[PDB]
Each structure stands twice: as C-alpha cells, then as structure tokens.
C-alpha cells in the first residue's frame, strides 16, 4: 500500500489522516486522532464563519412607483443590481479562495505527520518517496505504535539497522 504522494486510502475509514503499516504480523490502518480532530474543528469553524457572519434584517422589496415616477424606479433598479453584482462577485470569489485554502490545509497536515515520522527514524529506515518508510530493521506492532506516537527508540535498533543498511547498499 502506497502513501499520500500517490493518493488517498479507501481503507482509512476512521479519520482524515493516519498511518498504514506492514510487518510480519500483517498489515493494517491506524488514524491520527489529534490531527484529524483539530482539522475537523478548523474546517467546521471556517464553514460556520462564512455563514454566521452574514447580517440580515427585515426588508420589504416591491414596486410602488407609478408611470410618472420612472426616474425613481430606475434609481431602485440601479441599487438592486449594484448589490446583486457585489454579493455575486464576493460570494463566488470567496468560495474559490477558501476551497483552495482548505485543500492546501489538508496537504500541510499530511506532510507534518510525514516529517514527524522521518525525524524519529533517521537512518534506521529508508524513504521510498511514495509516503512510506521501509525499516532497515524488524519493526513489530509495538515498534510501529512507538512510531505512531512519539516514543520511537532509535539507539535500540541502530545496530541491527546499521548491519542491514550496509548489506543493501553493497548489493548483497
């Protein structure tokens, strides 16, 4: 299973961002609760802000001018069309800008999760370039969980990782 650089996971059905592991105990998916919940809060606030910050009051819109008051009727027409153009232009552009902001917001969160993992593993693992890391050592389910939270023990596996790193690079 590839990672974020390739596309989304249909197997991730419990969160927005998360992990997929593959060891000798099998594979599986695990979502990052904190970054998923905070992202959901931010998008929820953004949508609510766009809706709740609009001020509306009572207005009675009609046509109460006779055939010898056409100049005033034209003034009403110019005002109504002017407000139509202002709201139409602002609403279309605002949605386009905020949609771009939201999709860029998702990309940053995924990269931050990737960079947190890459810092822990250091040279104990190899970056495949698809969003995945191949471990230069055996990483069981408890080891995988230590990467998902921030408790990965680099010096524990460094000796094993070093031996297997040289074999791969020498062509063995």
């Amino acid at each position: 299973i590839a990672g974020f650089i390739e596309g989304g996971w249909q197997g991730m059905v419990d969160g927005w961002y998360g992990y997929h592991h593959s060891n000798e105990q099998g594979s599986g998916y695990a979502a990052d609760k904190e970054s998923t919940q905070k992202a959901i809060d931010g998008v929820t606030n953004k949508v609510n802000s766009i809706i709740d910050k609009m001020n509306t009051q009572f207005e009675a819109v009609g046509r109460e001018f006779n055939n010898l008051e056409r100049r005033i009727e034209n003034l009403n027409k110019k005002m109504e069309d002017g407000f139509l153009d202002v709201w139409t232009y602002n609403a279309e552009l605002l949605v386009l800008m905020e949609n771009e902001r939201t999709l860029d917001f998702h990309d940053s969160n995924v990269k931050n999760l990737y960079d947190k993992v890459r810092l822990q593993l250091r040279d104990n693992a190899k970056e495949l370039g698809n969003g995945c890391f191949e471990f230069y050592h055996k990483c069981d389910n408890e080891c995988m969980e230590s990467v998902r939270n921030g408790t990965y023990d680099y010096p524990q596996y460094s000796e094993e990782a070093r031996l297997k790193r040289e074999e791969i690079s020498s062509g063995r």
């Binding site: 299973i1 590839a2 990672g3 974020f4 596309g7 989304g8 996971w9 249909q10 991730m12 961002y17 998360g18 992990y19 997929h20 592991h21 593959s22 000798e24 998008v43 953004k46 949508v47 766009i50 809706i51 609009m54 009572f58 207005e59 009675a60 819109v61 009609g62 046509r63 109460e64 001018f65 006779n66 407000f83 139509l84 709201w87 139409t88 609403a91 279309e92 552009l93 949605v95 386009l96 800008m97 905020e98 949609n99 771009e100 939201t102 999709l103 998702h106 995924v110 990737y114 993992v117 693992a125 969003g131 995945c132 890391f133 191949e134 471990f135 050592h137 990483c139 995988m144 990467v147």
Partner: protein, 323 residues
C-alpha cells in the same frame, strides 16, 4: 524486496461531489457543503406568525371603497403584507382615481389593527336622496349598485340644500376616512342630479384644508359612463374632527376604518395560493429558508432573507481530495 513498512496517507471514499478552487476546476472531494438556497415551497405563508392580506381579484382601492364585486365580509383584522394580483379585475368600478394611491398602499401594507366602523349613517341626510346613487358601472347581481362604503347623495324635491356635517373621532385609534367628488358630463346632467350649477366640496380637519370643484367637460366613456369620480382620503387622529361642506357632487363617507400601524411592509403581486405555513422570508413564487447566507430564487422578497445572487452553486469543500 519489501521489508517492514510504515506509511502516511489520508481518507478517501466513494463520493463524487465536486468543488472549484481559484486555481482548479471540478475537483472531487470526500465531503462538501452548499451555502446557496435554491428551493422554495411554492406557497404564500405567514410572515413571522402573521397572515397576509390576500385580495383575490380586487385592488386596494376597490377593497377600501367597497366595490360590490369585492367581498365586503373580509375580516382580516391584522396582516404582515398584502397580496394583490398582477392585474386585479375589480378596481374602481365607476371610472376615476384614488388620490395619493401609492402612498396609501404602502401605508396599509402592514397593519396592526384594522376594523371597519359606521361613522355617518344614511339617516344623517334627511334633505337629500341616499338610495338613488346607483350606476351600471358598478353592477351587483347584474343590476346597478355602487361602492358600499360611500354614499352618492342626490337632490331631493328638485333641491340640494348645502351640507354642513362634522364627525369627531371619539375612538381611541386613527381613522382612515374616504370621500369623493363626482365630475358630471354637462349642465343638464349637473342640474338633474344636484340642481346647483356651481358646486363645491370643502373638507377641513386640524391639518386638512381642501376645496374641490367639479370639472364639467366632455369625456369618453369608461365602463359605459362619461362621468368621473375622484376619491380622497385622510387619517383622522383621535379627538380631532373632520368638517364637510358641499352643495353638490359630494360622495359622502359612510364607513371608515379604525387603523393602527406599527411597521412598514410592501405589496406583493402574486397568484400563488395560501398554504397555512409560516416563514421568515416570502417570495412571489414561494417561501424560502433563511438559514443560508445566499439564495438565487427571487429578488422581490419580504422578511429576513439571504442576499440575492446570480449564481447556480456556492459549494464549500469540507473534506479531502478524492481520486
């Protein structure tokens, strides 16, 4: 080849919802939310709990003056807006005009309390004929009639004594009072109806100083009648009195309307049926929900409404990119 691996990825599902960004078009996302209101219920509802005043095929003028083709038992004591039709079939049946019509319609668009009362009974004119003022222009059951709320006074015993009558508003509310003047066709018709060749109508209140003179001239037939009747109105504040003086061509008041106004509205032109519903935003094609900030239904709304835009969709991306 593959060893133990850990991967970073994100949610994808089967959704086909599409949003647009400033740089990309037709981007599929897992979840999206539209902020544009596009649906109406196709009914005329109450506005904030108050029923509208729906004049079926009558106009405000015909309804007020009591056109016999209008239901006179119309008993809506309070309303939030008035629904006329595009071309009401029952305007002033006798040709003429209502003075300051548009301002009167705006004044009556929303009314807190509205009651018709009898202020000058037909027994108040002992020296004039009160039952001979009927016309074929205002038929009822096929035969001639007249506006129900005003009296068309006629000479009695070939005499029209000068009228001097005053009404003091002893009620606790403002009174909407209507009266009119009849422009006759020629001298012979003027003498047949009122016996006085030179006539006048003077109306006086604390703030009203009116003097009306008939314009006797040749005119073309409208509704089969060459004469005209011009109607006027005033708001008589409590404890103030209205004073009438005339020696002919006087269309006297009979019924007035106790009126209490506590806000302004507009007249809606629509043929949609009443629906026994309620709404905070009413449009000529139906009621709409006012939760979303934008709508594209109709510009002639009443109430608290989303801003009207010329747009088909305003959908926000609230999920992740799908692929």
């Amino acid at each position: 080849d593959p060893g133990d691996q850990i991967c970073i990825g994100y949610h994808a599902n089967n959704s086909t919802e599409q949003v647009d960004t400033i740089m990309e078009k037709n981007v599929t996302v897992t979840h999206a939310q539209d902020i544009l209101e596009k649906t109406h219920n196709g009914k005329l509802c109450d506005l904030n709990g108050v029923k509208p005043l729906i004049l079926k095929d009558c106009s405000v003028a015909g309804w007020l003056l009591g056109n016999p083709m209008c239901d006179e038992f119309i008993r809506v004591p309070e309303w939030s807006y008035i629904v006329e039709r595009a071309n009401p079939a029952n305007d002033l049946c006798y040709p003429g005009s209502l003075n300051d019509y548009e301002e009167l319609k705006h004044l009556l668009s929303r009314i807190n309390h509205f009651e018709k009362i009898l202020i000058i009974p037909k027994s108040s004119w002992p020296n004039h004929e009160t039952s001979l003022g009927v016309s074929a222009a205002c038929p009822y059951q096929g035969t001639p009639s007249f506006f129900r709320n005003v009296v068309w006074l006629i000479k009695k015993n070939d005499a029209y004594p000068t009228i001097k009558i005053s009404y003091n508003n002893t009620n606790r509310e403002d009174l909407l009072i209507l009266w009119g003047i009849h422009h006759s066709n020629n001298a012979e018709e003027q003498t047949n109806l009122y016996k006085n060749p030179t006539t006048y109508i003077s109306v006086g209140t604390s703030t009203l100083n009116q003097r009306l003179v008939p314009k006797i001239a040749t005119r073309s037939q409208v509704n089969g009648l060459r004469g005209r009747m011009d109607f006027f109105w005033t708001i008589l504040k409590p404890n103030d009195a209205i004073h009438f003086e005339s020696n002919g061509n006087f269309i006297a008041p009979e019924y007035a309307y106790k009126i209490v106004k506590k806000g302004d509205s507009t007249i809606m032109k629509s043929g949609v049926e009443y629906g026994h519903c309620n709404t905070k935003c009413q449009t000529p094609v139906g009621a709409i929900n006012s939760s979303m900030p934008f709508h594209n239904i109709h510009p002639l709304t009443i109430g608290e409404c989303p801003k009207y835009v010329k747009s088909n969709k305003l959908v926000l991306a609230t999920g992740l990119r799908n692929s």
